[PDB]
Write a protein that binds this ligand. Sequence first.
Ligand SMILES: *[C@@H]1O[C@H](CO)[C@@H](O[C@@H]2O[C@H](CO)[C@@H](O)[C@H](O)[C@H]2NC(C)=O)[C@H](O)[C@H]1NC(C)=O
Ligand SMILES: *[C@@H]1O[C@H](CO)[C@@H](O[C@@H]2O[C@H](CO)[C@@H](O)[C@H](O)[C@H]2NC(C)=O)[C@H](O)[C@H]1NC(C)=O
Ligand SMILES: *[C@@H]1O[C@H](CO)[C@@H](O)[C@H](O)[C@H]1NC(C)=O
Ligand SMILES: *[C@@H]1O[C@H](CO)[C@@H](O)[C@H](O)[C@H]1NC(C)=O
Ligand SMILES: *[C@@H]1O[C@H](CO)[C@@H](O)[C@H](O)[C@H]1NC(C)=O
Ligand SMILES: *[C@@H]1O[C@H](CO)[C@@H](O)[C@H](O)[C@H]1NC(C)=O
Ligand SMILES: *[C@@H]1O[C@H](CO)[C@@H](O)[C@H](O)[C@H]1NC(C)=O
Lengths: 201, 595
Amino acid sequence: PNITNLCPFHEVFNATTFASVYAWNRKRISNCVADYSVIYNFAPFFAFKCYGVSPTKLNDLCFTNVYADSFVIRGNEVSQIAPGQTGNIADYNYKLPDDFTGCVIAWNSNKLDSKPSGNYNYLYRLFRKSKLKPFERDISTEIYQAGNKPCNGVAGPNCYSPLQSYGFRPTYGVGHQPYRVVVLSFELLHAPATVCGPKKS
Amino acid sequence: STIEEQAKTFLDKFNHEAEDLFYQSSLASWNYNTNITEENVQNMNNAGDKWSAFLKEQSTLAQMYPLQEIQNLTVKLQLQALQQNGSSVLSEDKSKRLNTILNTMSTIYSTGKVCNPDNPQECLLLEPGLNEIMANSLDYNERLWAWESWRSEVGKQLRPLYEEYVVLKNEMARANHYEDYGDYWRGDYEVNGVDGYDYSRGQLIEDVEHTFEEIKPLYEHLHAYVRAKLMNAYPSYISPIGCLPAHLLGDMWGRFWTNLYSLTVPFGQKPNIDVTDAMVDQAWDAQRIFKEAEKFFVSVGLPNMTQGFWENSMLTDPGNVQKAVCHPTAWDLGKGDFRILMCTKVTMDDFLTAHHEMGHIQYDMAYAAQPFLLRNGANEGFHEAVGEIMSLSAATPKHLKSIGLLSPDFQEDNETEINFLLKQALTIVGTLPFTYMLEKWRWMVFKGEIPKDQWMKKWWEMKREIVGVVEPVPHDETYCDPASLFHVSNDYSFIRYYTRTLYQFQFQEALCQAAKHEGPLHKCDISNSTEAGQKLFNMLRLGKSEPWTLALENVVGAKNMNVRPLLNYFEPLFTWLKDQNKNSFVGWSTDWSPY
Ligand SMILES: *[C@@H]1O[C@H](CO)[C@@H](O[C@@H]2O[C@H](CO)[C@@H](O)[C@H](O)[C@H]2NC(C)=O)[C@H](O)[C@H]1NC(C)=O
Ligand SMILES: *[C@@H]1O[C@H](CO)[C@@H](O[C@@H]2O[C@H](CO)[C@@H](O)[C@H](O)[C@H]2NC(C)=O)[C@H](O)[C@H]1NC(C)=O
Ligand SMILES: *[C@@H]1O[C@H](CO)[C@@H](O)[C@H](O)[C@H]1NC(C)=O
Ligand SMILES: *[C@@H]1O[C@H](CO)[C@@H](O)[C@H](O)[C@H]1NC(C)=O
Ligand SMILES: *[C@@H]1O[C@H](CO)[C@@H](O)[C@H](O)[C@H]1NC(C)=O
Ligand SMILES: *[C@@H]1O[C@H](CO)[C@@H](O)[C@H](O)[C@H]1NC(C)=O
Ligand SMILES: *[C@@H]1O[C@H](CO)[C@@H](O)[C@H](O)[C@H]1NC(C)=O
């Protein structure tokens, strides 16, 4: 039958504004046709690591839900968006499970996320009491109490605000330039799988 | 919950905001240095002010973590670096007076104009003119007039300033739990808490003495040879048994002897190994000079240069309308940003200097992963040593024939080797007794071993006894003869040059035995040897995280300064100098026999 109602990948990999890694954006994708070829031809990618499925078989597979997680991190941390990794981003901002079935896609975004005075609108969580569970988000701005005395809400000695800014500038080194990351997570449930690829005649 | 975890979290916060503010400060300093305009001046001042403010408040917050209960060495090292109170430990009046004294010493040294009597319509400054006369002229009385006049004027105007300076710096050091300012300066080499690799502040003086005692025969032979040649240059003024006259050393102070190659040449008929002509014939622009340096560094195994290095560095003078500082400088802005500010021209020199500064940038790149306060050399000597080894390896006849600057039919006979080693000796072995003497005088005047009214008498005596250089006329305490040098008038440590000189040849032997070199050390090249680049990179990546003794053990297999590589480097020149000093008298007398 006619191919219509393609999945909105042109709204995930091409938004005018991405999200901070602490408040990472999640879009559920269901009841549409998954044309991953647009994802393929959308920019040169610094990493297209796929964990659990092969990059080609995707179109001929049909999944129940597809989760697209979008955020901005620094280049050095792109290695942390993988199963089994540690760091500030993996432990306190975005965690993938050890049996993750999906792909991680990252690309450079100097022309969109770097300013010369410094882009101070991209934040990351530096201080957290415990490590994050997989696919969890913390938006709390609670003053991290690193000492023994209670902080009482006001920032002060041994009391640090947990969200630190990614001061992106265009003259930074490759490891510190802003990178936009989209994580595609495929899940199958007992429900009928409604995200499959195109058919031909 | 414990003190160590609070220190770790505080250091994480400090590292994040330090890298951001330091990057803004370094970018403003770069914008002033590449574009001298008043708005760039005020931007650099505001960024530097915000950085010094940050490092002040953060040091105040950093001193609430005592060091005796922190067991991790990296956290301990970062907190030791951060908790230093500097000049803030004094009262506000004394601190303001100290900064006023330092500023006025800087302005007297920078704007010191000394000229000829009876011709006062215009006068001559030190940097444009005095270096020329003291480095090129062959007239005894002219050099005497310039030397005596500059030391007389600058010493009379700087002696009470130095008199207050020593007292204020001694109070600063003693309030900072140091014995004296000399101990404060020797604290850069101090290693505490690591078993086997421990190094004390006080051990440096005897290590320097123990190396200099083995430096002394070679230096004595070199001194005798130089003396004989200068006797050919100046017939009656210099004595065979005495020291060299002070204003005949080729510099204003006698720091380098490299200006005496013309007078003291072993074989004047033989040419040098200057390859400037081959670069100008083949049209080697600055870009290709840095590309050849990059090819050498990737040949030895180190990383390529970043994209931002090629995009952001200013490797050529921009023009007349836009003014820039012409000093060759390697910049580690941070945030992965590495740049070289160099007004490159086409010369053999600028080529070697490009190798030197790219060695600096490779050192800065290897240690980048380290925390912010440990992104430095393991001591003050390593950073320049790792650039000077590249300058050593790139200047060899093998490397010049490898890259096509030198003809493949070039004959390396022993005479051009003697010539090269003597130029290197005048630059390297000549500066060692001056450096050791100057630092030892500064150490004793900070320690109080030298009485206040005995400064000049002690200094000149040591110059006669150590350097083998005699004063032209006696100087009383109205003069401040050490303070005529840039480093001592502007509060800079001076033992870094001695340590760098020894570390240079130690690193060179380690890399050359790593690269399987089968000849003399001065002919060695580390090009295409990846085991030598790996051996060096094992020390470069550490930064300041490990003790400098451990980094030295990583490269040379020894944990202390050794003088054997330096004397092994100058071994054929040592045999040659022994051969041609048979008729002459090696050694000097402390009597005033020349003058
Ligand atoms: C740096 O200066 C501060 C301020 O004077 C020092 O802090 C004081 O240290 C003394 C000695 O232990 C204490 O009695 C004071 O109570 C401290 N005052 C404060 C406000 O902390 C600090 O010890 C100095 N540190 C160094 C390394 O010199
Ligand atoms: C290091 O290795 C390079 C590459 O093998 C050498 O460069 C070659 O040198 C030979 C000498 O006869 C030439 O015939 C080749 O054309 C050169 N190749 C390239 C790609 O330049 C180089 O000589 C070696 N040694 C040093 C000291 O650099
Ligand atoms: C993708 O982004 C570019 C950036 O300007 C834009 O020109 C283009 O229209 C976008 N495409 C889609 C399908 O949104
Ligand atoms: C140097 O500063 C002037 C100040 O007006 C500016 O116009 C010029 O663009 C600057 N040059 C560079 C290379 O930034
Ligand atoms: C010191 O702390 C760092 C992290 O800050 C850690 O990687 C290192 O292993 C620690 N060293 C020791 C000896 O515990
Ligand atoms: C970077 O280094 C690799 C080998 O380490 C080399 O193949 C590559 O050509 C270098 N890059 C450039 C731009 O020359
Ligand atoms: C150079 O080598 C020749 C050949 O043996 C020798 O006669 C001459 O004395 C040597 N000269 C020097 C300065 O070593």
